Amino acid sequence: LLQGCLLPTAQQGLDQIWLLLAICLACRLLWRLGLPSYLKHASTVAGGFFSLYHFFQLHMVWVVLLSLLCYLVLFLCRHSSHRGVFLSVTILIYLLMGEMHMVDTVTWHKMRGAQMIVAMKAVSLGFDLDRGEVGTVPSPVEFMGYLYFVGTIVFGPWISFHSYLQAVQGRPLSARWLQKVARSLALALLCLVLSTCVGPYLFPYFKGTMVRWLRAYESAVSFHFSNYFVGFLSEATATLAGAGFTEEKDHLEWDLTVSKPLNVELPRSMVEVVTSWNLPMSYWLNNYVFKNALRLGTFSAVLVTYAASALLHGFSFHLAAVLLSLAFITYVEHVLRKRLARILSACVLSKRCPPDCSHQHRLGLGVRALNLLFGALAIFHLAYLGSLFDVYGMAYTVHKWSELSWASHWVTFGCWIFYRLIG
Template sequence: MYYIVGFAVGAYLCLFLVSCLLKKHRGPILGLASIVFLIVCELCFVNKTEWHKIRGAQMLVAMKVISIAFDTDFGALQCLPSPAEFTGYVLCVGTCVFGPWVPYRDYISIFNKPLWDTKWLWRIFTSVLLAFLFLTVSTCWVYWLIPDGAWRWWIAYRDALSFRSSHYFVSFLSEASALMSGFGHHEDEPWGLSVARPQFIEIPRSLVQVVVYWNVPMHSWLKNYVFRTTKPLGSFAAILSTYAVSSLLHGLNFQLAAVLLSLGAYTYVEYVLRQKLSVVFGACIQVRPCRRDCSHHSKEKCWTVVLGNVGLGLVVMFHLSYLGVMFDMSSKLQEEGYNYAHTLAKWSILSYASHWVALGTYIFYLLV
């Protein structure tokens, strides 16, 4: 608790001093300061087991602080929040433990004519119910359906599915905690708050779609405050910067960094390949569904386009099984975080197949 509260206090003092001295670049400065603080704490002051327990809460504090700094740079906030407003936002009871990240304007809006009704209660109930449903899938059902003696790729799919289900558990639990605090009420969509959408991940169209719906609020944060600010350096540099910042916010974890950076390279290769194929064949096979009035002559419902999208979706499922295989439930590794030996051992069992497929996909893109 002291590290989390100390981080919040130190971040506000740093933001106040930077605002007094400079009228711009507050976002990059606070972003660098937050990442340095997290790395120094992890390396020097907190043991691995204890840090692993508070890493998520620290990451949420960092995301909120950085978003306020960038919003003041962009002009979305006319002035810095007061210490009380800042503390209420950063340490909000509904979002400081499980998340999700919410913009400062959404935090302010929960005090504007707060509304509680039966839809609100039903939305909380369904989120909690889905959370514990995925908890049982993660800890029980997948191991019953796919036992240890199965084919190695079935084992890989099982371990990856177990990890994804545990993520859905936390995501729906964070939905419920945020809804209890009054987040998610909009005029056009009463109590519309979505953190993860499992249906778009388990039956994916593309890796880009998986990245977006894995954690919708964090995707929004990365897109607004990292991707768009680094886009002038080029698309590939912006994508790698986005995944690098995401991995640093999650901590010094080789396994997570390897997965995120691999995912960044995969999504770039997939995007450029499907973009080129959509032009060559005039088909709706881009990473995102096309608009109804797009210029492609082969639309989404054309059987060749359906087969193409299904085939590319199966490749995505293959990559997800490979990338998620090392997130097993080994208690010792889970408590301290996964090291590089564990990651390479898991991938070597699968002969680094996903990386070879990604390399072959990129070569194919160059030859098209």
């Protein structure tokens, strides 16, 4: 195992990503030299081209296409107060065309992440221009540098245009920065190693229904650690490039957090799981899709947000089914937890209550028991939904979920039934 899984996996992951980290660090050193803004943006553009070429070979043209297309659309509507609408429509078109299989499936899937981040960045800049957070429409070099920020191009977290400009302005290289990068890299490598070695072999070492749930859980936990690897790597790359900082009370804190594994592995609620899964993505979907879809109602906005999330990850039927089930699961858990908190004056909300909340029962045994029951239900939902990601169409999804006897959906139905009845 020591030289059988750990070392090969660590080599596999650290090997390819090394170049990306190198360019992030190079960008960071180059952006502290006091170069003009134009030069900084152009430099990161060239770095983004080289990183995209390194990860996707000649097939980087699709991302290049999207980048130019989004700028073209933004430029054509540079005076319109509905820039986010036009950019979202053009992203919709491009994504749908790609999902229509016009491009090779292997090639398309290979760069779903980079294209997702570019699309999220373009839509976010359009909506920030609409709401007035960004004063003027950016120059071509600033927009292209924002899309090709080398710390946020391949697996990078979505960052706002203002966050990108703050990264451009630069910050002094400090011990705190290096500790953040090192911690993120170590956690990324650990999560990758866990995903490949610890995760898959959890229950056999570390075909009844119990066996099926064990296999489902280990496939879910392996998928989670793979996602955590991507999240921590994204934190490492973004911090190493100079972004992801919070200038709070004239005190700089490099605290960009993409994923919170402890809040998903040990979950209080499925809402917490979804939020902690990818904080940049959750924020993006919440601010640039959910708030714009509030005119359809709250539940319809939840469905629109999850459908946009399904399109951003690429339309595969298992992931679309997972996100459609997650909308109902999170909503039902949320409402039931809320109503239980109201009726039972307890701190059993989907998030932790503040220290000044009106709930009478705050630390009792019943509150801990209810939170543990909902956390076990959340782990159960995670194993159910993550069973689809073992190492895929409608038939696979149906059969695989039938192997688990549709337990989560019945449980979701029961929670929903309970919610309506008690109120």
